[PDB]
Amino acid sequence: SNASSRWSKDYDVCVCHSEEDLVAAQDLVSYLEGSTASLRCFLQLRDATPGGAIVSELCQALSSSHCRVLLITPGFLQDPWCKYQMLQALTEAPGAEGCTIPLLSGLSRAAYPPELRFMYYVDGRGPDGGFRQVKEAVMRYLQTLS
């Protein structure tokens, strides 16, 4: 019986970046792009938008993604509803999948998220590297892949 992996993978991973720190996200994907033609990219910061309004199709994307990344914005911590959902991703229900990668850009070490409130920190380069940990945490998922 024949077989193919055309619909085996819909999307690798969708990293949520900020409107002001959008460049950071563009630089990240740039790395993975180096790999074979297995990784898919999506850049949208040149031409106008479809209608002008902003849509939130990430909620579904992350669900069909191997990894997940979040950008701790300054407004989030300032808002209760935002922060309330922050620790929620870390204290998610038991037996839940979808490891999230803490991405901080221009944030105060003291105003850091609760995600870093654990002894089992991120290992790799050594020093605090939100961009180095996110780039390695993502690609890592592909490393195991064929």
CSV table of C-alpha atoms in Angstrom, one decimal:
chain,number,residue,atom,x,y,z
A,1,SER,CA,0.0,0.0,0.0
A,2,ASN,CA,1.3,3.5,-1.0
A,3,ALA,CA,1.8,6.3,1.5
A,4,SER,CA,2.9,9.9,1.8
A,5,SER,CA,3.5,12.6,4.4
A,6,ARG,CA,1.7,15.5,2.7
A,7,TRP,CA,-0.8,16.1,5.5
A,8,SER,CA,1.4,14.7,8.3
A,9,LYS,CA,2.4,18.2,9.5
A,10,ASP,CA,0.3,21.4,9.2
A,11,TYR,CA,2.6,23.8,11.0
A,12,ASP,CA,5.9,23.6,12.9
A,13,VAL,CA,5.3,26.3,15.6
A,14,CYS,CA,3.7,29.7,15.8
A,15,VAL,CA,5.7,32.2,17.9
A,16,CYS,CA,3.7,35.1,19.3
A,17,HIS,CA,5.6,38.4,18.9
A,18,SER,CA,4.8,42.0,19.8
A,19,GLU,CA,3.8,44.7,17.4
A,20,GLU,CA,6.9,46.7,18.5
A,21,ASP,CA,9.2,43.7,18.9
A,22,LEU,CA,7.9,42.0,15.7
A,23,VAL,CA,11.4,42.2,14.2
A,24,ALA,CA,12.6,39.7,16.9
A,25,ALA,CA,10.2,37.1,15.6
A,26,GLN,CA,11.3,37.6,12.0
A,27,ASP,CA,14.9,37.0,13.1
A,28,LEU,CA,13.9,33.8,14.9
A,29,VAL,CA,12.2,32.1,12.0
A,30,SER,CA,15.2,33.2,9.9
A,31,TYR,CA,17.3,30.6,11.7
A,32,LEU,CA,15.0,27.6,11.3
A,33,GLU,CA,14.6,28.6,7.6
A,34,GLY,CA,18.3,27.5,7.3
A,35,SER,CA,17.1,23.9,7.7
A,36,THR,CA,15.6,21.8,4.8
A,37,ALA,CA,12.3,22.7,3.1
A,38,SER,CA,10.5,21.0,5.9
A,39,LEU,CA,10.1,24.1,8.0
A,40,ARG,CA,7.4,26.7,6.9
A,41,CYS,CA,7.7,30.4,7.5
A,42,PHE,CA,5.2,33.3,7.3
A,43,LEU,CA,6.2,37.0,7.1
A,44,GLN,CA,3.6,39.7,7.1
A,45,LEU,CA,5.0,43.2,7.7
A,46,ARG,CA,5.4,44.7,4.3
A,47,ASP,CA,2.1,45.0,2.4
A,48,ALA,CA,-1.2,46.2,3.9
A,49,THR,CA,-3.5,43.9,5.9
A,50,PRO,CA,-6.5,41.9,4.7
A,51,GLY,CA,-9.2,44.5,5.5
A,52,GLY,CA,-7.2,46.3,8.2
A,53,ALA,CA,-8.6,44.5,11.2
A,54,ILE,CA,-6.4,42.1,13.1
A,55,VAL,CA,-7.4,38.5,13.5
A,56,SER,CA,-6.4,36.0,16.2
A,57,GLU,CA,-5.8,32.7,14.4
A,58,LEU,CA,-2.9,31.8,16.8
A,59,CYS,CA,-5.3,30.2,19.3
A,60,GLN,CA,-5.9,27.5,16.7
A,61,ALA,CA,-2.4,27.5,15.2
A,62,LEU,CA,-0.7,26.7,18.5
A,63,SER,CA,-3.1,23.8,18.9
A,64,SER,CA,-1.9,22.3,15.7
A,65,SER,CA,1.7,23.3,16.4
A,66,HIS,CA,4.6,21.3,17.9
A,67,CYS,CA,5.9,24.1,20.1
A,68,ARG,CA,4.5,27.4,21.5
A,69,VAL,CA,6.1,30.8,22.3
A,70,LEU,CA,4.8,33.8,24.2
A,71,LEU,CA,6.1,37.3,24.4
A,72,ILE,CA,5.8,38.9,27.9
A,73,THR,CA,4.5,42.4,27.1
A,74,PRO,CA,4.6,45.4,29.4
A,75,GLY,CA,0.8,45.8,29.2
A,76,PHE,CA,0.1,42.2,30.1
A,77,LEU,CA,1.6,42.5,33.6
A,78,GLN,CA,-0.2,45.8,33.9
A,79,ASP,CA,-3.5,44.1,33.2
A,80,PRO,CA,-5.1,41.6,35.5
A,81,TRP,CA,-6.9,39.6,32.8
A,82,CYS,CA,-3.6,39.3,31.0
A,83,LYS,CA,-1.6,38.1,33.9
A,84,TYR,CA,-4.4,35.9,35.1
A,85,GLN,CA,-3.9,33.9,31.8
A,86,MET,CA,-0.2,34.0,32.2
A,87,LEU,CA,0.2,31.7,35.2
A,88,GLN,CA,-2.7,29.7,33.7
A,89,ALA,CA,-0.5,28.4,30.8
A,90,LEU,CA,2.1,27.2,33.4
A,91,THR,CA,-0.4,25.8,35.8
A,92,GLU,CA,-2.4,24.2,33.0
A,93,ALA,CA,-4.5,21.1,33.6
A,94,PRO,CA,-2.6,17.8,34.4
A,95,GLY,CA,-1.3,15.7,31.6
A,96,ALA,CA,-1.4,18.7,29.2
A,97,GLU,CA,0.9,19.0,26.2
A,98,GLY,CA,2.4,22.1,24.5
A,99,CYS,CA,5.6,23.3,26.2
A,100,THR,CA,5.6,27.1,26.1
A,101,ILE,CA,8.8,29.1,25.7
A,102,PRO,CA,9.2,32.3,27.8
A,103,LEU,CA,10.2,35.2,25.5
A,104,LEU,CA,11.1,38.5,27.1
A,105,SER,CA,12.1,41.6,25.2
A,106,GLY,CA,12.7,44.9,27.0
A,107,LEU,CA,11.2,43.7,30.3
A,108,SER,CA,12.4,44.3,33.9
A,109,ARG,CA,14.1,41.3,35.6
A,110,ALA,CA,12.0,42.1,38.6
A,111,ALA,CA,8.8,42.2,36.6
A,112,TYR,CA,9.6,38.8,35.1
A,113,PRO,CA,6.8,36.3,34.6
A,114,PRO,CA,6.0,33.4,37.1
A,115,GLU,CA,7.2,30.9,34.5
A,116,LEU,CA,10.7,31.6,35.8
A,117,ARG,CA,9.6,31.0,39.3
A,118,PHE,CA,10.9,27.4,39.3
A,119,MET,CA,14.2,25.8,40.3
A,120,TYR,CA,14.4,23.8,37.0
A,121,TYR,CA,15.4,26.7,34.8
A,122,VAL,CA,16.4,26.5,31.2
A,123,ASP,CA,19.7,24.8,30.4
A,124,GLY,CA,21.9,25.4,27.3
A,125,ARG,CA,24.2,28.3,26.6
A,126,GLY,CA,24.4,29.2,30.3
A,127,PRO,CA,23.4,32.9,30.8
A,128,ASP,CA,20.0,34.4,30.4
A,129,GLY,CA,19.1,33.9,26.8
A,130,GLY,CA,15.4,34.2,25.9
A,131,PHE,CA,16.2,34.3,22.2
A,132,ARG,CA,18.8,31.5,22.4
A,133,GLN,CA,16.5,29.3,24.5
A,134,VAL,CA,13.5,29.9,22.3
A,135,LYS,CA,15.5,29.2,19.1
A,136,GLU,CA,17.0,26.0,20.6
A,137,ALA,CA,13.8,24.9,22.3
A,138,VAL,CA,11.9,25.0,19.0
A,139,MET,CA,14.5,23.5,16.6
A,140,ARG,CA,15.0,20.8,19.2
A,141,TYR,CA,11.6,19.5,18.4
A,142,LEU,CA,12.7,19.1,14.8
A,143,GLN,CA,16.1,17.6,15.7
A,144,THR,CA,14.3,14.4,16.8
A,145,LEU,CA,12.3,14.5,13.6
A,146,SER,CA,13.5,12.7,10.5
